[PDB]
Design a protein around this ligand. Structure first.
Ligand SMILES: O=C(Nc1cc(-c2cn(CCNc3c4c(nc5ccccc35)CCCC4)nn2)ccn1)Nc1cccc2c1[C@@H]1CCCCN1C2=O
Ligand SMILES: O=C(Nc1cc(-c2cn(CCNc3c4c(nc5ccccc35)CCCC4)nn2)ccn1)Nc1cccc2c1[C@@H]1CCCCN1C2=O
Ligand SMILES: *[C@@H]1O[C@H](CO)[C@@H](O[C@@H]2O[C@H](CO)[C@@H](O)[C@H](O)[C@H]2NC(C)=O)[C@H](O)[C@H]1NC(C)=O
Ligand SMILES: *[C@@H]1O[C@H](CO)[C@@H](O)[C@H](O)[C@H]1NC(C)=O
Ligand SMILES: *[C@@H]1O[C@H](CO)[C@@H](O)[C@H](O)[C@H]1NC(C)=O
Ligand SMILES: *[C@@H]1O[C@H](CO)[C@@H](O)[C@H](O)[C@H]1NC(C)=O
Ligand SMILES: *[C@@H]1O[C@H](CO)[C@@H](O)[C@H](O)[C@H]1NC(C)=O
Ligand SMILES: *[C@@H]1O[C@H](CO)[C@@H](O)[C@H](O)[C@H]1NC(C)=O
Ligand SMILES: [Cl-]
Lengths: 530, 530
């Protein structure tokens, strides 16, 4: 009744779920695509053919095939991001939380997970949509999309592996929401897409892409933006990496057809076991199979589209965390450890700068080093550690996002910018890692409202504040409720943003402006000239 | 008797001068070279031919021909640097102050004036040697040398205008002191050469040049060093500037012989009136006719000599003032005025860095700008003003001297480094100009001991401290008297220096190390790329 919904592709039966001493409706694992298996590996997705009978939507779906992180086996801080369901190429499903009783036509929020375009799952505990759906009375959808080679192997000119098909998975789930969310009490004209890291870059890519623009109303980007250096490659580099994948697996490389036929014969984990081998440099915060600037999903270069205003004009809300770079250093840079303060020697600092800016020549590396080194105190291991942390976060997340925010605001209809700098009281990671990439998600999704998880009362209040900003923005284009302190519009001239933490809101201006002139203006000019 | 001295070139008669309620002997205007006039213009100096009779040495000599500064007619702050005697090409003279009664064999200090190698006079009020000679019981000499085209026109390969003849003037005066100062009670084995700005660069140039090394014992460099960017040119650039001088005067340019012959026929003022026209760029802190790296006075490049230890190994005392760049901006950069706070707009800032680093390409100018701009507050006219001030001082004086001191200390026998940051209570210049290039000289020469000049008691104490440091260093190679606070040696590892001011001594380390990494390491590497 409330749990039995007839959609344009067939009937679905959801389940009644408890939430915070109440209940709401969950529809888990609804298919929005034909399974992209067999001959459909690497191909654009196809709409799900209608089914007869009742689709059982009581259980989370499979997760897409991906490299599983084993660096810290059994450690919750890393395991919380790994697939928690069986992995399968048959993974194109979405999940829906609906307030109970079903509202008439309410705001919809669609979550796009991150994971560097090589990993990610809609089913992680921190993406549980029920607290936000219940607390803010929104219809909350989480989609899925192919990652790694399965989603982003790009042999431009082939229609069998054109590239960007994981972005097209996202778009097909948005099309399904557009066509069906009315049956779940959602308003298809008031859909907000939001996501973090690669999911934030994805949100920005749909803002840019003409074929995506009519499938949502407004957007939220968390710790990612479409212009991030890791978020896309050229057609030539994508082809190079695809050919090198075939080389690693002893494939015929004489033609796209023969290469693709070979790759389609391999078991999924065979592809995954060599995926990191196709990267051109030793690096951190770089991923093998990512979106390609193809001339179709992206009609021209990202920068030209931003400069000309060739993008969807709407409201955006976006922001970054204080220490975006810290876990990346843990995973690939010398001298870092989860079990120590990770004081970094001068030698390991120089190695880390090179891993962090792998495309830079030696003069570019010198420029980065000078910008982040205190030459009154250059053997300070804490300053070396924190300097590397800032390099990774500034280069890969904060300054790309500030470039996006300044270009977008010239043409958009409203920008709201935040700086999340609260360290959770119950964090399992060491203090040197600070406010880590991804650790605002648990506040956005209301996990501190769960007493059993042992957040402080101020952390519950912060989460409620953030959920209300997010959902009020989603409903109206403005995070502030009329009548009371106000989160001010970010403007080209004043460039205001707010901190998000347990203290009373403070307004600041020009987020990280000094370092981002270096990353966005000077270093690109230096690398181009040298 | 005491005032009658027979030298190797002939007899001289000095004069008895009052000083601080006592008296000392002065020997003013002693010739040490043949007048470099007529066909001797531009040529190496010749020793003064012996004279008969008694040279009347009671009067200051003529000053060398030079561009006279008329920017502020009648203003003492600028007029105090202009020639105060008649100008003449017949200007190669020296002055000697001798304690009374005549000492037996005492320490000698020889002053080399600055003035950008285009100006300067031994006879300025602030170079009056009588207070230092009387107070510290030293024999004090001030020499002279040809400036401008007369001293540094350079047509390499010609023996008629080889370049560097002003430096050979200085060397001939050092040779005269070596041969004759014993007759005045001075020890030729304990001669300290000291000088400021171009005079300080000159002192460092005699440290490097083999033909000079044996003519002094130890050295003091004030706000100047031999590697300063304004202090030398290549043989090719020296030739270009010489030919351009001839072009400005409608000279035959077909050979060095004809060019030189044309220039020797011109009145001195004719050369001076076009001197500034040969500079390659609009600039500040750049001078037309300066030492040339010739393969003779300087056997190889300054950097290669510093790197190999090819220089005199002895003790040095050297340092800088807080605001070296300030008067240079007043003289040639937009927005600066002696009669205002000189708050600098962003537009005038950009023009100022271009005038300050004239040799830099656009990428280099961006790098300077980024290094000295606070992008949280880029329209602050006070920050823009002080940033430009720092740029001029760091690039032209402080960081070249810090490079010299770090290279010298690897091979030398004792380095003492100071930072002079006292603004005089009776200064005639506005507050924004701070601690100005040249304004430590009056303390070195003891002018605050003259009650009539209205220095404070604390400033007289500071002057007495500085004169005792300078003279104790001259006598012993160590500015400290073994018995009490102590000025520590500058070492490669700890890099210590002291402030010089009216407060109790502070020891610091790594003088302006952050900016000097930029000027000494990064920017040269940037400018040398594709
Ligand atoms: O894995 C590699 N590099 C790497 C991984 C990552 C990485 C790891 N993870 C784990 C995912 N978990 C987390 C997520 C987030 N936050 C986290 C916070 C803490 C811990 C895990 C997190 C937020 C966004 C969602 C995901 N994400 N990114 C980031 C940057 N570089 N390199 C690698 C792995 C195997 C083999 C090789 C390599 C390298 C690559 C370079 C060439 C040579 N290599 C190999 O052969
Ligand atoms: O004079 C010019 N520039 C300039 C002068 C100077 C300059 C002036 N002076 C006066 C000397 N007096 C002082 C001294 C010292 N301190 C002083 C402190 C305050 C005032 C005068 C001082 C300490 C060292 C001894 C000298 N010294 N340096 C410094 C840097 N740039 N440019 C100029 C002049 C005439 C014509 C032209 C130009 C420019 C040159 C560039 C090309 C175009 N130009 C001209 O046509
Ligand atoms: C050397 O020159 C000085 C300076 O002109 C002569 O001394 C001046 O002489 C006049 C009268 O002859 C006195 O009124 C001044 O007081 C003197 N000034 C100084 C500074 O001494 C001196 O007589 C000359 N001696 C000679 C020519 O033998
Ligand atoms: C749907 O699946 C769940 C678990 O697999 C089960 O508990 C439920 O009864 C199923 N409903 C059906 C088959 O109608
Ligand atoms: C958004 O657009 C409306 C209508 O064009 C305009 O009135 C409003 O000022 C805009 N707001 C912003 C923040 O651009
Ligand atoms: C949460 O707090 C309760 C109450 O003290 C405690 O029993 C439980 O172990 C805590 N859980 C965690 C994961 O810290
Ligand atoms: C100076 O040289 C002497 C002679 O070798 C040496 O004993 C002394 O340690 C040196 N002093 C410094 C400060 O280098
Ligand atoms: C010194 O001060 C006195 C009184 O304060 C004044 O008469 C005299 O002119 C001053 N001298 C100078 C050189 O300024
Ligand atoms: Cl100042």
């Amino acid at each position: 009744s409330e749990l039995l919904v007839n959609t344009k592709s067939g009937k679905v039966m959801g389940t009644r779920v408890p939430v915070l001493s109440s209940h709401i409706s969950a529809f888990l694992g609804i298919p929005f695509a034909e399974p992209p298996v067999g001959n459909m590996r690497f191909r654009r997705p196809e709409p799900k053919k209608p089914w007869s009978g009742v689709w059982n939507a009581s259980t989370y779906p499979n997760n897409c095939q991906q490299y599983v992180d084993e660096q810290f086996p059994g450690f919750s801080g890393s395991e919380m991001w790994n697939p928690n369901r069986e992995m399968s190429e048959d993974c194109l499903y979405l999940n829906i939380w609906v307030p109970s009783p079903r509202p008439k036509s309410t705001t919809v929020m669609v979550w796009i997970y991150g994971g560097g375009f090589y990993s990610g799952s809609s089913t992680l505990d921190v993406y549980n949509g029920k607290y936000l759906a219940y607390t803010e009375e929104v219809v909350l959808v989480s989609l899925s999309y192919r990652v790694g080679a399965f989603g982003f192997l790009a042999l431009h000119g082939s229609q069998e592996a054109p590239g960007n098909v994981g972005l097209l998975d996202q778009r097909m789930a948005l099309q399904w929401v557009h066509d069906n969310i009315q049956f779940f009490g959602g308003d298809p004209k008031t859909v907000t897409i939001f996501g973090e890291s690669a999911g934030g870059a994805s949100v920005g890519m749909h803002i840019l892409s003409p074929g995506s623009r009519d499938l949502f109303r407004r957007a939220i980007l968390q710790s990612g933006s479409p212009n991030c250096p890791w978020a896309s490659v050229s057609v030539a580099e994508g082809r190079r990496r695809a050919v090198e994948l075939g080389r690693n697996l002893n494939c015929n490389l004489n033609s796209d057809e023969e290469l693709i036929h070979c790759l389609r014969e391999k078991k999924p984990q065979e592809l995954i076991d060599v995926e990191w081998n196709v990267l051109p440099f030793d690096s951190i915060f770089r991923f093998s199979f990512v979106p390609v600037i193809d001339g179709e999903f992206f009609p021209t270069s990202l920068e030209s589209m931003l400069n000309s205003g060739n993008f969807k004009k709407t409201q955006i809300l976006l922001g970054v965390n204080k220490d975006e770079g810290s876990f990346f250093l843990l995973y690939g840079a010398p001298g870092f450890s989860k079990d120590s303060e990770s004081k970094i020697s001068r030698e390991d600092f120089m190695s880390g700068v090179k891993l962090s800016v792998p495309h830079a020549n030696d003069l570019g590396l010198d420029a980065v080093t000078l910008q982040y080194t205190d030459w009154m105190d250059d053997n300070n291991g804490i300053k070396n550690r924190d300097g590397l942390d800032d390099i990774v976060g500034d280069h890969n997340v904060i300054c790309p996002l500030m470039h996006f925010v300044n270009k977008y605001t010239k043409f958009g209809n409203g920008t709201y910018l935040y700086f999340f700098n609260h360290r959770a009281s119950n964090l399992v990671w060491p203090e040197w890692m600070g406010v880590i990439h991804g650790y605002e998600i648990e506040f956005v999704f209301g996990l501190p409202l769960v007493k059993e998880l042992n957040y402080t009362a101020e952390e519950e209040a912060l989460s409620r504040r953030i959920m209300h900003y997010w959902a009020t923005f989603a409903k109206t284009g403005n995070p502030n409720e009329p009548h009371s302190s106000k989160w001010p519009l970010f403007t080209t001239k004043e460039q205001k943003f707010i901190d998000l933490n347990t203290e009373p809101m403070k307004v600041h201006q020009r987020l990280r402006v000094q370092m981002c002139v270096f990353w966005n203006q000077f270093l690109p000019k230096l690398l181009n000239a040298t």
